[PDB]
Amino acid sequence: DEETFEEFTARYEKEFDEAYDLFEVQRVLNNCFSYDLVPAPAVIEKALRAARRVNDLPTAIRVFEALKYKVENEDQYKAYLDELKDVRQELGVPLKEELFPS
Amino acid sequence: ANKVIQLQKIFQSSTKPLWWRHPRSALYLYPFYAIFAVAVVTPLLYIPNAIRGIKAKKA
Amino acid sequence: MVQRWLYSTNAKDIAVLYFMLAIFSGMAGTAMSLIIRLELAAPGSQYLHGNSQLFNVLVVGHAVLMIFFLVMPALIGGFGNYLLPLMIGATDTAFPRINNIAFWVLPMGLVCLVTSTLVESGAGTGWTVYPPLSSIQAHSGPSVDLAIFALHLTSISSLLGAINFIVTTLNMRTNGMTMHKLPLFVWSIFITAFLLLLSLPVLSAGITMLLLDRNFNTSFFEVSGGGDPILYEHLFWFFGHPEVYILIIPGFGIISHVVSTYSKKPVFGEISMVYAMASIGLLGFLVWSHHMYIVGLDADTRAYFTSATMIIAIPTGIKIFSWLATIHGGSIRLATPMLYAIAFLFLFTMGGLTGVALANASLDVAFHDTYYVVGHFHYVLSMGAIFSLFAGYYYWSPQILGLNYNEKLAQIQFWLIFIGANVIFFPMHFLGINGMPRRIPDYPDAFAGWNYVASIGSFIATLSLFLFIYILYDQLVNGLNNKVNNKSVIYNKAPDFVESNTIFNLNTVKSSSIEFLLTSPPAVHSFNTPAVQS
Amino acid sequence: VHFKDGVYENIPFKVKGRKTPYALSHFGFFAIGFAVPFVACYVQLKKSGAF
Amino acid sequence: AQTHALSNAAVMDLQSRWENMPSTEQQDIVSKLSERQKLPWAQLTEPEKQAVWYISYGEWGPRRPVLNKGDSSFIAKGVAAGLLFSVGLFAVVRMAGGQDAKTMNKEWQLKSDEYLKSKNANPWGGYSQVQSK
Amino acid sequence: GRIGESWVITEGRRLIPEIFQWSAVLSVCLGWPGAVYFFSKARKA
Ligand code: HEA
Ligand code: HEA
Ligand SMILES: CCCCCCCCCCCCCCCC(=O)OC[C@H](COP(=O)([O-])OCC[N+](C)(C)C)OC(=O)CCCCCCCCCCCCCCC
Ligand SMILES: CCCCCCCCCCCCCCCC(=O)OC[C@H](COP(=O)(O)OCCN)OC(=O)CCCCCCCCCCCCCCC
Ligand SMILES: CCCCCCCCCCCCCCCC(=O)OC[C@H](COP(=O)(O)OCCN)OC(=O)CCCCCCCCCCCCCCC
Ligand SMILES: CCCCCCCCCCCCCCCC(=O)OC[C@H](COP(=O)(O)OCCN)OC(=O)CCCCCCCCCCCCCCC
Ligand SMILES: CCCCCCCCCCCCCCCC(=O)OC[C@H](COP(=O)(O)OCCN)OC(=O)CCCCCCCCCCCCCCC
Ligand SMILES: [Ca+2]
Ligand SMILES: [Cu+2]
């Protein structure tokens, strides 16, 4: 398997637009986070807009939870939360730390 | 003579176990079972002497 | 009821009889090793009243029961007969009446070996039965005859079963499954069946010729008629080594399934695993005289067998690194089967590295009949093959039986045998390197130290076996309750990270073999319309 | 031949609905296994004159 | 869809009450929250949001862990109790064993060393036989 | 460029504690017979 990073985003962007129920959105999301890379910000945005279209809020919360496991530092987690600022605000998605604050 | 077809219909319409369906099977199975019992019991009736070291006096 | 279990032609029912007999025999062989370790606790006569023949008799009985009546009827007669037809889609085995005689000869071979120890004085010869110590001058009476007939009956069993395993794999696979698509456990019973087919007939020549010297006035091995004792050792060891691999490879295939399930990853380099299992099964026919390094063979004969023995370390080390590559980057689930598999990787490596030292003929001069050898082969047979037998039972018995077991009781059992096995066998290397011979009931006083330590660990490990006997009782009386309370593990695979709890209930099982897709106790008519794969 | 299916149906021994407790069968079976080496010792020590 | 919110008495602390709820009452909560998630998500209340997260990814049912809290401590206590019982049973069976050999004393072992020191035994690794009382 | 701290510092913080936990386990698995000899009569009288 010789797939460049640019080919990775353009293929999973196409794969999030075709998912037609909850099983499909969760199965595609599982395979996207199972490689040796963190998906690009433009892939995360299409995964949030796919869970809105099937009307499921917990799947959109878990997207950012997996993001904080896969990064290497906590400053890589921050820079994602600063790119996807409008989308998390426009759809009304909270963070798991914000929802169950400790 | 040829008796394959005739035995073919006797066998396929019988309720008994496989080794009992032939009309001649009583003559083999009755004496075999009696002989099979003697051939199993008798060696076992000798282990008591073998442990006790008693040898048969064929002399 | 009578005709379901005495007339059986079903491969699942026969596999249950095998396991029942296998576990009843490990009781006797463990009791003999406990009597042996009590008499070795201290210098002097301890419990056997100075009867050295009796001590030697119990050592033969210990080895024969553990090998030919526990590990072979359970790893092969049990798991092979139950899981091989289900993993390839077969409706039965080929030759179902052959499959039944290969079990019923083992009860008759036990009432031959047991009555051998009760007649005259028994057979105090070692499990290799070398002549002239085992001929009628040095062993009179019928004890060695009755032990040979017992070995003959286990050879009929393993040979007939091997012919059945080979035909079933080649002829009865299901739609779409080709030989490159077999599960790795099916490959391990298939290759083992070929080693048995090509090594058992040479052992039947050797021990039938020994029976002829004793009773028919023959000189195959008698020195007064021209015969040679060293011929017997060539014939015995040409079966022996292939046997040790007939005992580890089925465990290689079990370890592959367990490690992959509790990592959520497929086996790394699956195709090179079959090539390694075949290379080890082939090189196990070219190395047998490393067991005869000091009997006076030529120096050029000994230099060949050194290099032949060493190169079996290359394919085996490929399987060790391959197993560590599948658990790397995994999602590890530490259930009871996974604990044994991780201990197998650590304790089998140690036992195999002490074999590499033994492989050189120059160094084996200080390693002959030395406890050091006893330490080598209890690390690969008792922390090896035995640990893979526990891993198998905890992996498949809930499905096979429909009954769950107490999980936290099983983790206590694992730690008690891991601690106790190490205490028996680790100091055995210290005794051997300092020069303690094997097969002695009594020793000089300087060996008392480590011999006391090993006898303590023998009590720890027997207590762990008695806990396993209770776990079987609890599973059979309380197995249905173990599913509704929180005392057992229900799923060997948990939901994935982003997979919700209710989506997980659509497909509970994510398996790459058929067996976990059947009903819990599998149906007696398991396939009517054949299974199909792409 | 047709057999039954279920939980306690694929084993040769009875566990439920029996008069005597199943513990007498389970531990009696494994006791006899553990006890055959001691019967052998008794016979042979009674042959050497130790007893 | 059903627009009105679920009442506080219904979903106040879903995580703590979920395990004891009757099953038919669990199905009714799921049905009403499925119609509520079809609205824009900025309208939903916090107890409603915490309920939907808990039912999907909460540590229950399938997500039950291998060992319950307090199980590792039961395991460590059971292993240490198994070591004690086997060792104390060994010392009882030892008491039925045979007498000591006549040479296993410090007095006998010190004359052994007298003989070995003369013959120059083990000249760089030690020859002493003393291991007894 | 790269966001955050160097990968050496992040990996150093994770492995150093594990080196010491490895050497304290392998010493128990291989050195436990040394303790038996410590409390023996034969040792150091
Ligand atoms: C299968 C192989 C096997 C196994 C398991 C064992 C297990 C043990 N063996 Fe032995 N042993 C041999 C094979 C084996 N041995 C052989 C070939 C010889 C040489 C014979 C010769 O010299 O002639 C030998 C020799 C030998 C000697 C040498 C005596 C002398 O030279 O005279 C000693 C001495 O202590 C000894 C001890 C032990 C001990 C303490 C255990 C115990 O530690 C066992 C520990 C673990 C268990 C208690 C077993 C598990 C119990 C089961 C019933 C499994 C059930 C599992 C399921 C069904 C899931 N063994
Ligand atoms: C399960 C059973 C089993 C297994 C698997 C083995 C495996 C091996 N055995 Fe063993 N053996 C016995 C059972 C077994 N043996 C028994 C019962 C006896 C005594 C018989 C009797 O007298 O009664 C015996 C005795 C015996 C002898 C005879 C010694 C003597 O009697 O004096 C020799 C000789 O060389 C030997 C060597 C080996 C070697 C090299 C392996 C190799 O296969 C090991 C290879 C494995 C590894 C090497 C580990 C992992 C490897 C790597 C991680 C690769 C990297 C390594 C390097 C670069 C070195 N053993
Ligand atoms: C944290 C790291 C690991 C922590 C480490 C944990 C493990 C530590 C292990 C250290 C303990 C090792 C002790 C070894 C056992 C022992 O020393 O027994 C002492 C003696 C017998 O020892 P012996 O020298 O072999 O006897 C000689 C034989 N004669 C001559 C008597 C015939 O025995 C005697 O005769 C006198 C004692 C009699 C027995 C009573 C003692 C208590 C037993 C009670 C029974 C309870 C269980 C039995 C239930 C039926
Ligand atoms: C001590 C003196 C030595 C005695 C030798 C041991 C005697 C034990 C067996 C006694 C013979 C009874 C007949 C059973 C065989 C049979 O019937 O084979 C017939 C089987 C029946 O197949 P099926 O009914 O299972 O399937 C039902 C399909 N209709 O065809 C096959 O499998 C095909 C392959 C034939 C292979 C047969 C091998 C011969 C068995 C003996 C092997 C002994 C090896 C050790 C050599 C020393
Ligand atoms: C002694 C009692 C007599 C009571 C008197 C009768 C009065 C009425 C009482 C009702 C009881 C009827 C008694 C009938 C006999 C009976 O049910 O249990 C008696 C049976 C004996 O008989 P058996 O058929 O197993 O043959 C065997 C005779 N030698 O013990 C047992 O095997 C106990 C065995 C349990 C241990 C096996 C554990 C294995 C579990 C299966 C796991 C398989 C994994 C497979 C993986 C490949
Ligand atoms: C090893 C040296 C000493 C061995 C001999 C003594 C053994 C200790 C006695 C028993 C310990 C009981 C602890 C309780 C269980 C526990 O610890 O459970 C804690 C964790 C998880 O549970 P949790 O805490 O998350 O939840 C608790 C909820 N109640 O399980 C584990 O990590 C198990 C570790 C698995 C190890 C696999 C087998 C190890 C042997 C392989 C050799 C290792 C390699 C060697 C080279 C480095
Ligand atoms: C991987 C598995 C590891 C498990 C760990 C082992 C622990 C299990 C129990 C072991 C049994 C002990 C046998 C004692 C036999 C005896 O009686 O000892 C006798 C000796 C005296 O000698 P004596 O000549 O006076 O004897 C006279 C004979 N009648 O007294 C002792 O030394 C007491 C025991 C010392 C305790 C050490 C136990 C080991 C724990 C290791 C801890 C880590 C150490 C790390 C060091 C770097
Ligand atoms: Ca002794
Ligand atoms: Cu070998």
GROMACS .gro file of C-alpha atoms in nm, chain D residues 1-43:
model
   43
  696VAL     CA    1  -2.873  -4.089   1.440
  697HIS     CA    2  -3.064  -3.794   1.587
  698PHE     CA    3  -2.952  -3.666   1.926
  699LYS     CA    4  -3.066  -3.379   2.147
  700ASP     CA    5  -2.923  -3.028   2.170
  701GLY     CA    6  -2.873  -2.794   2.463
  702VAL     CA    7  -2.631  -2.734   2.748
  703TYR     CA    8  -2.596  -3.059   2.944
  704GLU     CA    9  -2.667  -3.287   2.647
  705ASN     CA   10  -2.323  -3.321   2.482
  706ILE     CA   11  -2.149  -3.489   2.777
  707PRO     CA   12  -2.167  -3.856   2.888
  708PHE     CA   13  -2.234  -3.781   3.255
  709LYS     CA   14  -2.539  -3.647   3.437
  710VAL     CA   15  -2.509  -3.323   3.632
  711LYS     CA   16  -2.869  -3.217   3.709
  712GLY     CA   17  -3.185  -3.389   3.819
  713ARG     CA   18  -2.990  -3.663   3.995
  714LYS     CA   19  -3.048  -3.804   4.343
  715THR     CA   20  -2.687  -3.818   4.460
  716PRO     CA   21  -2.489  -3.490   4.452
  717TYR     CA   22  -2.270  -3.434   4.148
  718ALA     CA   23  -1.977  -3.362   4.381
  719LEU     CA   24  -1.948  -3.732   4.460
  720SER     CA   25  -1.899  -3.813   4.090
  721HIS     CA   26  -1.676  -3.517   4.006
  722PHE     CA   27  -1.422  -3.552   4.287
  723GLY     CA   28  -1.450  -3.929   4.315
  724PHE     CA   29  -1.343  -3.958   3.950
  725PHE     CA   30  -1.034  -3.742   3.998
  726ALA     CA   31  -0.954  -3.906   4.333
  727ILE     CA   32  -0.916  -4.249   4.174
  728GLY     CA   33  -0.676  -4.103   3.919
  729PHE     CA   34  -0.457  -3.948   4.189
  730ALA     CA   35  -0.463  -4.275   4.386
  731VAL     CA   36  -0.323  -4.538   4.144
  732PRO     CA   37   0.047  -4.458   4.211
  733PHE     CA   38  -0.008  -4.524   4.582
  734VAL     CA   39  -0.172  -4.861   4.517
  735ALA     CA   40   0.135  -4.963   4.316
  736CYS     CA   41   0.370  -4.856   4.595
  737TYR     CA   42   0.171  -5.057   4.848
  738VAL     CA   43   0.192  -5.380   4.648
   0.00000   0.00000   0.00000
